[PDB]
């Protein structure tokens, strides 16, 4: 009857992920904010007007 508690889990895989993985995620979003979402193109891509 441990249903009394109210926590749970989904049955998929192994949750938390690895601190290194969080930084990669966080440093992409920070460069998305400050960039105001623009896609700054690569130098080789053969030129969507840039800001």
């Amino acid at each position: 009857m441990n249903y009394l508690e109210g926590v749970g889990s989904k049955k998929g895989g192994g949750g938390i992920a690895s601190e290194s993985q969080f930084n990669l995620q966080r440093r992409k979003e920070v460069e998305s904010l400050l960039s105001k979402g623009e896609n700054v193109p690569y130098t080789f891509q053969d030129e969507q007007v840039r800001s």
């Binding site: 441990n2 889990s9 049955k11 895989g13 949750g15």
Partner: protein, 123 residues
Amino acid sequence: NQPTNIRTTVLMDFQPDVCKDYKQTGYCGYGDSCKFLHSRDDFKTGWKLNQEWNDLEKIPFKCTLCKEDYKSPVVTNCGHYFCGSCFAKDMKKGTKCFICHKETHGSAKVASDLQKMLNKRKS
């Protein structure tokens, strides 16, 4: 004091409580809270290690040249077997086995052990 005259049928419990995520993976989301066993068993040496990165009869009875019975049989440095006429003729063209293509050097033993195993009496 369970009553004297009763037969109670055993009802098997076939459900194991094994936690299916911890049995497969070895990680269970729920943790120490999990309502089930967590016991972790694995199968039985199924796999065979072959690396791509890196009463058998091996004696044909009829020839590979005559396609006929071995007569005046011949042994090479392999387990190759031919007629005296067979092996002499192959060297007129081929350098090597008619089979391996390893170096025979024309080297041929009298193969009497063949006639033995081609006897019904062996030796």
